[PDB]
Amino acid sequence: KALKYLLFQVAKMGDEKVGGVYLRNSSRFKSLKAVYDDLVKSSVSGLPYA
Amino acid sequence: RDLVGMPKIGLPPDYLGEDAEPEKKAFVKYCQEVVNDLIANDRAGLIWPRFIDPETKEDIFEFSLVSRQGAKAYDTGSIIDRYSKQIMMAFMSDVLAMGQSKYGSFSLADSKTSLLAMSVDI
Amino acid sequence: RDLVGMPKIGLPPDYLGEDAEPEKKAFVKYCQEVVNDLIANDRAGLIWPRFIDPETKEDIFEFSLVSRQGAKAYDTGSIIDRYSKQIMMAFMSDVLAMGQSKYGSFSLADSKTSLLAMSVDI
Numbered sequence: 001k002a003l004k005y006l007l008f009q010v011a012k013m014g015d016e017k018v019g020g021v022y023l024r025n026s027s028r029f030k031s032l033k034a035v036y037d038d039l040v041k042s043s044v045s046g047l048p049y050a
Numbered sequence: 051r052d053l054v055g056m057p058k059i060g061l062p063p064d065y066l067g068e069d070a071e072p073e074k075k076a077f078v079k080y081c082q083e084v085v086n087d088l089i090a091n092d093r094a095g096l097i098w099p100r101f102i103d104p105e106t107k108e109d110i111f112e113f114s115l116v117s118r119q120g121a122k123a124y125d126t127g128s129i130i131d132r133y134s135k136q137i138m139m140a141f142m143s144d145v146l147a148m149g150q151s152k153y154g155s156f157s158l159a160d161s162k163t164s165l166l167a168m169s170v171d172i
Numbered sequence: 173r174d175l176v177g178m179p180k181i182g183l184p185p186d187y188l189g190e191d192a193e194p195e196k197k198a199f200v201k202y203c204q205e206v207v208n209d210l211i212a213n214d215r216a217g218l219i220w221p222r223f224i225d226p227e228t229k230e231d232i233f234e235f236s237l238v239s240r241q242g243a244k245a246y247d248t249g250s251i252i253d254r255y256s257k258q259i260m261m262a263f264m265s266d267v268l269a270m271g272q273s274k275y276g277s278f279s280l281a282d283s284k285t286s287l288l289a290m291s292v293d294i
Contacts, residue, residue: 034226042223042232045067047198049082049219050206052177052212053237060222078219085217106224116218119239120176128249136256139268154272161279162272 007036056116057085142166175238179207182234264288 010032013025059081065074088094102109138144142165145154156167163171181203187196210216220235260266264287267273276286280293 037223037226042063042225044063044199044221045069045195047202048066048206048221049078049085050202050210050217051179051210053179053210053216054177056212056216056218058218058220058235060220063221063223066219066221081219085219086215088217103224105226106229108224108229110222110224112222116235116237118177118237120241121243122176123174123240123244125249132249132252135269142268144271148271151272153274162277164272165267 003036003040007032053116054118057088058114058116059085060110060112060114062110142169176240177237179210180234180236180238181207182232182236184232264291 007029010025011029013028015026016023061078061081064070065078068075070078096113098113099111100109101111135144135147138147145164145166153162154164155162156164158167158171183200183203186192187200192200218235221233222231223233224231257269260269267276267286267288275284277284278286278289280289285293
């Protein structure tokens with residue numbers, strides 16, 4: 001539940017630059033999603049059925 | 051083992067499991083009955099969910115019939131027929147397959163004794 | 173060795189092993205049962221997990237029937253039949269396959285004596 005919530009928060013975040021400090025948040029969801037699908041979604045939790 | 055035309059259902063891994071949400075587990079149960087009870091009757095048909103993932107540009111759920119992309123090399127039908135004739139040739143019992151002819155006979159004293167009929171004479 | 177149409181199951185490498193999670197071992201075991209037991213009965217079907225990986229745009233779980241993309245060069249049946257005909261020609265025993273013809277007979281004293289009968293006479 002927390003991990004799904006983290007994905008939502010990361011997506012909404014945007015690129016911010018207040019004078020002196022800069023923070024590119026754009027290229028985080030792209031990276032985060034790839035791990036998420038690979039290590040969480042693409043992992044069966046049961047048995048198939050013939 | 052000719053599984054061509056067999057129904058195949060592809061579900062996301064999330065659906066398949068024990069910790070899946072009751073709604074998902076109910077869906078898997080219905081697919082089990084669909085697999086187990088689908089026939090080609092009058093009311094045959096399907097209402098399946100369809101979602102083309104924006105990523106990968108491919109759908110996640112599909113109901114498809116498994117297909118083969120080749121043909122069996124050797125024609126088993128003509129192969130067996132050759133051996134059956136060879137077996138009958140060994141015992142010279144071609145009358146079993148060909149049948150009684152109008153120029154062959156089983157009579158020993160006749161002038162046209164069949165090959166098999168003469169064998170019993172020996 | 174005509175393995176066209178045999179079931180082939182494509183699993184990610186992490187599934188195959190001993191340190192693999194107990195669920196993955198159960199998955200592999202059920203796949204083994206499917207491979208060794210699946211037939212083309214009336215409740216034949218399949219519920220396979222599937223996931224098009226965002227990268228490479230290809231599915232990871234892959235169930236399909238092995239297919240050949242060619243045909244045998246030589247027709248063995250005709251060749252074997254030709255050689256059998258040659259063998260019967262060598263012993264001049266065509267009557268074994270062709271059958272008793274109306275242009276021949278097994279009587280030496282007859283004017284229509286078959287070639288094989290003449291060899292027997294010799």
